[PDB]
From a paper:
Protons cross the membrane via two half-channels at the interface between the rotating ring and the relatively static stator component of the ATP synthase, and they provide the energy from the pmf required to generate the turning of the rotor. In the mycobacterial enzyme, this inverted L-shaped half-channel is clearly present, but the water molecules that form the Grotthuss chain were not resolved. The mycobacterial inlet channel in the a-subunit contains the polar residues aHis12, aHis15, aHis16, aAsp30, aAsn104, aGln112, aAsp117, aGlu122, aLys125, aGln192, aLys219, aAsp222, and aGln229, which are probably involved in the coordination of the water molecules that form the Grotthuss chain. The proton inlet pathway then passes through a small aperture between α-helices aH5 and aH6 formed by residues aGly196 and aAsp222 into the interface between the a-subunit and the c-ring. As in the bovine and other ATP synthases, the outlet channel is more open and funnel-shaped. Alignment of the substates via the a-subunit demonstrates that the c9-rings and the membrane α-helices of the a-, b-, and bδ-subunits of the substates are in identical positions, as are the ε-subunits, and in some instances the lower part of the γ-subunit. During rotation through S1 in either direction, the γ-subunit approaches very close to the PS at b′Arg72, and potentially a salt bridge could form between this residue and either γAsp170 or γAsp171. Unlike the tether, which can be formed in any of S1 to S3, this feature can form only in S1, when, during rotation, the γ-subunit comes sufficiently close to the PS for a salt bridge to form.
The membrane domain of the mycobacterial ATP synthase is embedded in the IPM, with the catalytic F1-domain of the enzyme extending into the bacterial cytoplasm and attached to the membrane domain by a central stalk and a peripheral stalk (PS). As do other ATP synthases in eubacteria, chloroplasts, and mitochondria, the enzyme couples a proton-motive force (pmf) across the IPM generated by respiration to the synthesis in the F1-domain of the enzyme of ATP from adenosine diphosphate (ADP) and phosphate by a mechanical rotary mechanism. The mycobacterial rotor consists of a membrane-bound ring of nine c-subunits, attached to an elongated central stalk, made of single copies of the γ- and ε-subunits. The mycobacterial PS is made of two proteins, bδ and b′.
Author numbering:
A (entry chain H): 3 to 7, 19 to 56, 59 to 80, 107 to 120
B (entry chain G): 53 to 66, 219 to 234
C (entry chain a): 10 to 247
D (entry chain d): 1 to 59
E (entry chain O), N (entry chain Q): 2 to 86
F (entry chain b): 22 to 82
G (entry chain N), H (entry chain M), I (entry chain L), J (entry chain T), K (entry chain S), L (entry chain P), ...: 3 to 86
The structure:
């Protein structure tokens, strides 16, 4: 598994596009989209409205350091 | 994070390589 | 029967053959260009609102000067500025005059054009390309010396690729000429092909092709000028 | 003759396309450039007058 | 036997067809690649739209040339066939 | 019927083009460069004049 | 056999080569340019307006070459040079 | 040797070349455009609606040439130009 | 030389060209579409389910071409146009 | 001469073209799909199991075409259509 | 004129086509797969251990086609079908 | 049949092949190098002067091959080796 | 004309096809593998020491193909199968 | 009735044309790809201009080699044609 700051999957939208992180994903630094949403699936999936975050995938850990409204709607499912 | 961006990016803002979704310079700027 | 080549008004002088049609087309283009130049010289103004001719001429000058300055200092190669620009306009006019409806029947079903773009003649393109070739090679010799310049061109960026460099140099003129040639030559043929259609069907494909050929001629003039400036900058360094 | 008429109609179509779609934008570009240079000249004259007024007032 | 010029012209037509086909393939693919670069560059930043058309039209000039040069030679084989006897 | 062989016109065209070049060298490009340079000089002088007028009225007080 | 038969067979094969090459070039170039355009539009919707400017230029060149072939093939097939 | 035999053989060769080139171009261009579309859909799920429009355009062009080839192949073999 | 022999040889070569071009186009187009699909799934494993709808479309536009060519091969080799 | 010899030579050339096209398409398509698979495995090793599914489809979609060509090449060289 | 001579010439042309297509496909596919592998190793120096698994699969799928073509090429020149 | 007729027909076909290959190679290589140059210009306004030195090295090679081919075409066509 | 003449002409054409295909494959595959190596070295200058290991493999798997073709080309030209 | 040497020479010329066409395609495209990589690398790291040449040329060294090998064999086909009677 991977340490999200334990989970199984981390779905997120970056400036490049939608990105999903699995346990051994390569190291990565990305900028979350202005209205980004984070879905952490662990052995129910937690949905977070992240605004202006930064994704940082490491060998072991994944750190997630009108746009805000859209992020809220996406997190709560209205999109 | 900023140190990792700077190490693999141009310093001109006014083992395993980190992957950067957009180019390193834009992330460094933001 | 398509009648490729087949220059008209061919005459002879000093044991040399001259295609009269090509000379006439080139003369008409030169007359148009000189008329534009003299209209500018008459209406050139630094204080009043510029006329359309001045706008066009200064747009061309600004363009060519920008590429020159980017590639090589204008002070280093000022003489490149006129040459480049004139080349452009020359070629441009030589192509755009082809849009005029000067195609008629040849009394045997073969289309004949009163005016044919001179670039469709190998002599015109070869003259322009060889003049540019000699010009920038002379500029390179002057900048680097009669003995130094050949050494630089043969050795090029990397000396171990000396043979390729030589070939590359020989590729500069012909690639400049033939390219232009083909760009116009094909058009000269293509319109003739469209002439095989009946008028009530010939009008449309001819219209489409000539509308596109306008842009083709513009792009070819621009490419010739840009590559001339490029070669000048390449041959004047260090 | 026949092909001459066909190519004449083709040139008429070309001229119609030009006048209808290409002439307006290029004419607008030329007008914009003329207005810009005229405005620059007007600003230059107005700045000269402004300096004259400032010098007269000061002295 | 058969008229030599017939064989000459058949070979000339085959060669010209090969020349034009190769030129068309090269021109189309190269122009597509250059246009891909141009469109992607404009997408990445609109303000660069002015500075891209200069290198781009150099590329086309270097690319499209290969087409028309061949075209010229194609005509040479087809309209004035070398060794036509 | 080879149309690729150079002809006598290679010289004739080379003459006409040269003539055009001459005109463009001495009656198009020099005047246009002068007009442009005068225009950038005008713009710079206008900007400097505005700043100088502001500074000079300020110093008048 | 009639020499014109040989001339026409050669002309047909040459025209087939011309059209095949033109089709390959047109298809692949249009596909590449359209890939660029589709990716650009996917990245940001706003660019849809501006991207169409270079795209039609690209096509404008690519397609043009194809149609040139489309004409020369006719020259080969309908009015065969040196038919004699 | 029947002249028509040589004419038909040449026409069949040319039509085969035309279809070969057309299929190569159509297949590769459709593949490239579809690659762009698939990447866009994967990265931007919402962009799908605004991606089918440009994609179709590309496909259109890519198909156009191919279908054009079709016609001429049908011309080459069924009604061979220059047939004796 | 029986005229039918020449016609059949030409038709067989034409069919071979048709299939060669079709196979090249189909293989490369399917490969490129698959590259897009695999890259999309690797970047976003959950997206797999929603990436088949575009992918298939692309494959369609590829396979169709190939199969169309295949059909015409039959005409060339089994009911040869212009065969005497 | 024997017409069957001409027909056989045409069949051999056609089958050679079929195999050439099939080999080009299969090799390039498999290379592209494998490039995608290698890149995806490099990016997300834990997605390996999820990536072989589309990969096998694309390869399955590519090799299929190639083998279809075999199914028609053998015919050409073993049951030659129109052979006398 | 010996019919076997014509059949052998056709077989040689077919074998040349087979091997040319196989070489093109194998070379380009291997190049693409190796490009993927080299980029993956460049990003992850320690990833090679796993990247060699899919890579060898890709090559396995590519060379396979090549060596099938070679086999059939040997069936063209050494035991020519239809050679009487 | 005149030996020179067949020899020079083969020479013309060979020169056509030389130019087809040269055109394909030059066009595609120049397109690729220009794609690199355009990308570099797009993401670095000031890199132009720096990127031209490598660019025209690449072109310096690409064009070279093309023109070498062209040279040999002349030898193939205007002074055919083995002509008699 | 002697049967050996036709057989040797076919052998020469087949060898030419083999060499052309092999050269295309080798050149393009080596170019792609290079592109990968240059990109990797640009990204990680120190990685060169390791990057040459996979690269060679790729080049190997490419060059082999080419050289294999070479052998068969000789087999076509110097000891022609089926020669009479 | 026909000279066998004529047929052999025509076949040799077609074979040499194929050799050169394939060699030119391979050389042009491979050099274009390698140069694309070199240009991208120099754009990313201007300081790497001298470092990237060692791998770049190696690639070219392979690419051109294949091409020139073809060239040699073409000289074999057309000038000293194997199988000439």
């Amino acid at each position: 598994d991977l340490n999200v700051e334990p989970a199984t999957f981390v779905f997120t939208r970056t400036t490049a596009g939608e990105i999903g992180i699995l346990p051994r994903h390569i190291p990565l630094v990305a900028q979350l989209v202005d209205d980004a949403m984070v879905r952490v699936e662990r052995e129910d999936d937690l949905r977070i409205a992240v605004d202006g975050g930064f994704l940082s995938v490491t060998e072991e850990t994944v750190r997630i350091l009108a746009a805000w409204g859209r992020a809220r709607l996406r997190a709560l499912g209205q999109i | 994070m900023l140190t990792e961006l700077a190490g693999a990016s141009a310093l001109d803002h006014p083992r395993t390589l980190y992957s950067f979704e957009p180019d390193p310079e834009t992330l460094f700027d933001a | 029967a398509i009648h490729v080549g087949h220059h008209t008004l061919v005459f002879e002088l000093f044991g040399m053959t001259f295609n009269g049609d090509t000379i006439l087309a080139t003369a008409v283009t030169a007359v148009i260009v000189i008329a534009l130049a003299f209209y500018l010289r008459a209406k050139v103004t630094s204080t009043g609102v510029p006329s359309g001719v001045q706008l066009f001429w200064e747009a061309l000058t600004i363009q060519m000067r920008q590429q020159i300055e980017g590639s090589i200092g204008m002070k280093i190669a000022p003489f490149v500025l006129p040459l480049s620009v004139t080349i452009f306009v020359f070629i441009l006019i030589s192509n755009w005059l082809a849009v005029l409806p000067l195609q008629y029947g040849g009394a045997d079903g073969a289309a004949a054009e009163l005016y044919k773009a001179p670039a469709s003649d190998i002599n015109f393109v070869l003259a322009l390309a060889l003049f540019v070739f000699v010009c920038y090679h002379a500029a390179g010799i002057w900048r680097r010396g009669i003995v130094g310049h050949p050494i630089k061109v043969v050795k090029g960026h990397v000396a171990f690729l000396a043979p390729i460099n030589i070939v590359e140099e020989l590729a500069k003129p012909i690639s400049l000429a033939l390219r232009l040639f083909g760009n116009i030559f094909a058009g000269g043929i293509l319109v003739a092909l469209i002439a095989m259609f009946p008028w009530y069907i010939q009008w449309f494909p001819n219209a489409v092709w000539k509308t596109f050929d306008l842009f083709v001629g513009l792009i070819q003039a621009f490419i010739f000028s840009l590559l001339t400036i490029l070669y000048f900058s390449q041959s004047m360094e260090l | 003759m026949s092909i001459f008429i066909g190519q004449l109609i083709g040139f008429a179509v070309i001229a119609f396309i030009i006048v209808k779609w290409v002439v307006p934008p290029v004419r607008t570009l030329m007008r914009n450039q003329q207005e810009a240079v005229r405005a620059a000249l007007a600003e230059s004259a107005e700045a000269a007058k402004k300096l004259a007024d400032a010098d007269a007032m000061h002295a | 036997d058969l008229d030599p010029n017939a064989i000459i012209t058949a070979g000339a037509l085959i060669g010209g067809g090969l020349i034009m086909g190769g030129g068309a393939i090269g021109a189309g693919i190269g122009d597509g690649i250059a246009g891909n670069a141009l469109i992607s560059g404009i997408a990445r930043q609109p303000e660069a739209q002015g500075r891209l058309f200069t290198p781009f039209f150099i590329t086309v000039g270097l690319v499209e040339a290969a087409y028309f040069i061949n075209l010229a030679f194609m005509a040479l084989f087809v309209f004035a066939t070398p060794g036509l006897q | 019927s080879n149309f690729l062989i150079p002809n006598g016109t290679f010289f004739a065209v080379l003459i006409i083009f040269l003539i055009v070049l001459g005109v463009i060298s001495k009656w198009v490009v020099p005047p246009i460069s002068k007009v442009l340079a005068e225009r950038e000089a005008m713009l710079a002088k206008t900007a400097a004049d505005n700043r100088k007028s502001a500074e000079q009225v300020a110093a008048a007080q």
